[PDB]
């Protein structure tokens with residue numbers, strides 16, 4: 120049954136709770152972003168209102184075939200009223216169309232649900248600055264001090280230089296980028312831009328990207344694999360067997376694949392730096408795993424929470440074990456101690 124951490128008290132609202140059936144008491148279902156563990160159970164047969172960003176609305180309509188009459192897109196950074204309750208959507212710095220939700224309760228309580236987010240100093244100058252927040256429903260994916268990773272910009276710089284060098288040395292080398300959901304488009308689009316290419320992909324992935332309000336997107340992407348020296352593939356196909364096969368499909372037009380797997384965290388981040396990474400090479404194919412995160416590092420998360428000063432924190436990730444829960448609660452007490460709220 121629907122967990123408490125997906126319910127907004129003193130409203131008829133749930134958040135990312137589509138896989139429980141009809142939740143008793145729910146008049147409006149919010150969807151923070153289009154990732155499968157969060158929309159799980161939405162379909163063309165869903166008959167209750169869905170509140171979400173314009174981009175997430177494009178994806179529900181065009182990918183899941185949800186009927187238009189149930190989709191309520193809201194603009195960002197705008198005071199909106201939903202079934203009598205003031206709400207605001209804020210950019211979550213996660214994947215395209217991902218939002219955080221501010222709920223202003225009739226009683227005067229203010230609630231922030233982060234969805235999935237990568238906390239950033241810039242959030243300290245949004246509409247969150249303008250009043251007290253009592254409760255925080257927090258993306259705790261990497262809530263442990265060992266999770267350090269570099270800035271997105273650093274990782275993108277590394278990827279652009281590596282690709283450029285390899286292709287300049289061998290103009291018949293192909294770049295491949297793995298994907299499985301929306302998110303991490305900056306990795307492949309930055310690589311393509313530096314190489315003066317469009318990105319080649321399947322028709323299904325092409326449609327997906329057409330939903331994202333990316334400016335000039337038609338000048339950036341393509342289905343024509345032949346006219347394209349950055350390609351996208353399923354992450355499931357980013358391995359030697361899967362790459363070889365794909366190299367065989369290109370019709371003797373490339374003699375070398377440089378591929379990137381954008382992974383969240385791996386235990387090689389507790390030792391090695393970004394400058395000091397290496398690939399896994401079997402022949403003319405080489406696969407790099409790069410630590411491109413769309414969730415908060417430990418330190419990013421800690422700074423955000425210390426700034427916001429919430430009275431209560433409810434974790435939304437890593438909640439299924441007692442050890443995880445207990446460990447998160449300890450970090451939250453230390454943060455409040457070190458800062459004095």
Ligand code: NI
Nearest residue numbers: 152154213235
């Ligand atoms: Ni997500």
